[PDB]
Nucleic acid binder design. Structure first.
Length: 92
DNA sequence: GATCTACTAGTGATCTATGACTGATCTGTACATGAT
DNA sequence: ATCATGTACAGATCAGTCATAGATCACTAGTAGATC
């Protein structure tokens, strides 16, 4: 596909933050995205001065979308990303 | 009725598994050469 | 005139080598238990 990849680790550092997000040697995008989403919803509940809510998950989105009633409606995609300083995959 | 062996509690050293620094490798641009 | 080949330079990433926390090992006082 060139666009799509499976993510493996060389080194499980120790207990490692991301161990809970593993489905083998493979980092699970859906687990990570679910915990991310959970945290965001938790904090969003604690916002009392702004009308902000979490939008229902859109299929094919790497984001957690917020609807803000700043009277007018504003949508904010909070996109979970992994940063890699290695050289770009061959497909590029 | 006292002294040597088997076990428990307690302390502290020694050994054993993980993050940070340095050298080695890789990729590409600028330039010199050689071809039409 | 222009385009392919080889060298230096530059920056970045990757692979290989030391300080720190937890586990393990050694020794001693105190017991009980067995012997004289």
């Amino acid at each position: 596909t060139g666009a799509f990849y499976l993510v493996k680790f060389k080194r499980i550092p120790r207990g490692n933050p991301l161990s809970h997000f593993l489905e083998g040697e493979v980092l699970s995008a859906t687990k990570m995205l679910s915990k991310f989403r959970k945290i965001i919803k938790e904090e969003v509940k604690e916002i009392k001065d702004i009308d902000v809510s979490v939008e229902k998950e859109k299929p094919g989105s790497p984001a957690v979308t917020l609807l803000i009633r700043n009277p007018e409606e504003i949508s904010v995609d909070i996109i979970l990303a992994l940063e890699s300083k290695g050289s770009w995959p061959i497909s590029t």
